Design a protein around this motif. Structure first.
Motif, short mmCIF file in Angstrom:
data_model
loop_
_atom_site.label_atom_id
_atom_site.label_comp_id
_atom_site.label_asym_id
_atom_site.label_seq_id
_atom_site.Cartn_x
_atom_site.Cartn_y
_atom_site.Cartn_z
N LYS A 170 -2.06 -17.41 28.25
CA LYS A 170 -1.38 -16.59 29.25
C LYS A 170 -2.39 -15.74 30.05
CE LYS A 170 1.26 -12.20 29.05
NZ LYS A 170 0.53 -11.79 30.29
N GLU A 171 -2.08 -15.53 31.33
CA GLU A 171 -2.92 -14.77 32.23
C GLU A 171 -2.78 -13.28 32.00
OE1 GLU A 171 -3.75 -16.48 36.25
OE2 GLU A 171 -2.93 -14.58 36.96
N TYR A 172 -3.94 -12.62 31.87
CA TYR A 172 -4.00 -11.15 31.68
C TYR A 172 -4.93 -10.54 32.72
CZ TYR A 172 -1.83 -11.78 27.04
OH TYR A 172 -0.99 -12.10 26.01
N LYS A 173 -4.51 -9.43 33.33
CA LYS A 173 -5.33 -8.72 34.34
C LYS A 173 -5.85 -7.44 33.67
CE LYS A 173 -2.74 -9.54 38.71
NZ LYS A 173 -1.60 -8.74 39.23
N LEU A 174 -6.99 -7.52 33.01
CA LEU A 174 -7.54 -6.39 32.30
C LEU A 174 -8.06 -5.34 33.27
CD1 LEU A 174 -9.51 -8.23 29.54
CD2 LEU A 174 -7.11 -7.73 29.69
N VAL A 175 -7.59 -4.11 33.12
CA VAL A 175 -8.11 -2.98 33.89
C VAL A 175 -9.51 -2.63 33.38
CG1 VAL A 175 -5.75 -2.22 34.13
CG2 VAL A 175 -7.17 -1.23 32.37
N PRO A 176 -10.29 -1.81 34.09
CA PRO A 176 -11.70 -1.63 33.67
C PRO A 176 -11.92 -1.14 32.25
CG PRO A 176 -11.41 -0.91 35.96
CD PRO A 176 -10.03 -1.21 35.42
N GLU A 215 -10.12 -1.69 29.80
CA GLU A 215 -9.81 -2.79 28.90
C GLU A 215 -10.93 -3.84 28.84
OE1 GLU A 215 -6.21 -4.00 30.60
OE2 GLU A 215 -5.03 -3.68 28.73
N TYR A 216 -11.47 -4.26 30.00
CA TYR A 216 -12.52 -5.26 29.93
C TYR A 216 -13.83 -4.65 29.42
CZ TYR A 216 -14.08 -3.95 34.87
OH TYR A 216 -14.50 -3.32 36.04
N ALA A 234 -12.96 1.38 26.54
CA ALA A 234 -14.26 2.01 26.64
C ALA A 234 -14.57 2.28 28.10
CB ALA A 234 -15.35 1.14 26.02
N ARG A 235 -15.51 3.19 28.31
CA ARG A 235 -15.91 3.54 29.67
C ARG A 235 -16.91 2.56 30.24
NH1 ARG A 235 -15.18 4.82 25.08
NH2 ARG A 235 -17.47 4.73 25.10
#
Lengths: 228, 228
Positions: free
Chosen positions: A39-45, A47-48, A75-76
């Motif tokens: 499934k497609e996931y759009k990780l915000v910063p 998150e990635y 994490a930052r």
């Protein structure tokens, strides 16, 4: 909890490195496909950054890429403290730390081999600038100017710093010996550079003037690391 | 600079460890014999903490002891960030981190072997308490209260903490997802515990209540690590 495979992490990091080429900072999100149901996931910063932090922990501690990573944390940035393995590999360890922030990780030894690091002489600045392209990077020598460090940190590029630890004894106080040293500036406050020092720790704060003037008699630059 | 051989470092660690066993904090100095001149040297806390920090960097990064360590730096303690090598070795990594502070270093894998850590269930607090004496340690189960934590940090004894990362989600956003986790409390501010989290970093600050109350439904203790 969604997990992403080794192939997916390599693909996402290449796309991160590629976005960073533009000098416009980090993307707003990163597309990833889990290994279980694709499934497609759009990780915000955050998150990635958290995902690639976990990846780099395993890679640095075990010396091999993880076959999969579960998204468990945020994490930052993806930076994981990595200490130099010898008393003469400070420069390639700093380039390895930069490679984490640029999402194009190269291990300490891989950098050492490329840079030509040696037991008698360490690594000179010209060696770092001349050989970083072997690993896919370009080094930009900049003035030892906090406004310049800050300008290139906005673009997403960390800054390798070089100084003689004896010249920081009174304005920082980390060292009592006499030798030249490298670390990675990855953040700044209003008054201090935040440096990942491979012999000391991940957030050694130097007052701008302290670090700026600690290479008196030696090359008057810092060294931005960016995609080639 | 002044350097000390592995044999002197191993012996000085024994004497530090034996001193800490008294529960009266760290000694005011550590006397050691140089490895060139074979002269007596009196190291103050910042020097012996820095020397053993450098020793531990080499040991953790290389998996073997350094043949000698040169005194180059100062530090308020010898702790070197060490990450867990799997998703289930948080507890022996936390014990290994403690073993640095106690000057009786045991690697993450030595600790996991002793504790009986398993890929399936991780390690329980009872396994920690019952098997730590194999490595030379005694665990004192203590109340989840800052007053108690400060008392044993004053004695030189670090404190393993245990919590459920989902219960810390709104008071300290480090984790998403649900699982139990271990870290090492090695310092505190007026309001926060300073935690070395083997999955995130060396100085994760947890407000006293956030950590204390994040283990509802599980054993209500923290775990002081001290010499047996």
């Amino acid at each position: 909890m969604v997990r992403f495979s080794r192939d997916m992490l390599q693909d996402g990091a290449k796309r991160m490195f590629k976005w960073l080429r533009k000098g416009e900072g980090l993307p707003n999100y990163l597309i990833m496909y889990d290994m279980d149901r694709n499934k497609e996931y759009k990780l915000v910063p955050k998150e990635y950054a958290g995902l690639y932090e976990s990846r780099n922990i395993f890679w640095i501690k075990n010396g091999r890429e993880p076959n999969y990573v579960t998204l468990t944390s945020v994490a930052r940035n993806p930076l994981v403290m990595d200490y130099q393995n010898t008393n003469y590999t400070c420069c390639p360890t700093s380039l390895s730390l930069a490679s984490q922030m640029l999402y194009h990780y190269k291990s300490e030894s891989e950098c050492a081999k490329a840079l030509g690091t040696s037991k008698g002489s360490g690594t000179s600045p010209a060696q770092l600038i001349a050989n970083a392209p072997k690993l896919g990077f370009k080094i930009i020598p900049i003035k030892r100017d906090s406004k310049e460090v800050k300008k290139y940190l906005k673009k997403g590029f960390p800054v390798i710093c070089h100084w003689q630890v004896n010249q920081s004894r009174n304005c920082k106080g980390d060292y009592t010996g006499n030798f030249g040293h490298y670390g990675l500036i990855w953040d700044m406050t209003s008054t201090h550079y935040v440096v990942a020092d491979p012999a000391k720790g991940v957030n050694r704060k130097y007052k701008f003037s302290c670090l700026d003037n600690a290479n008196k008699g030696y090359r008057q630059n810092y060294y931005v690391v960016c995609p080639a």
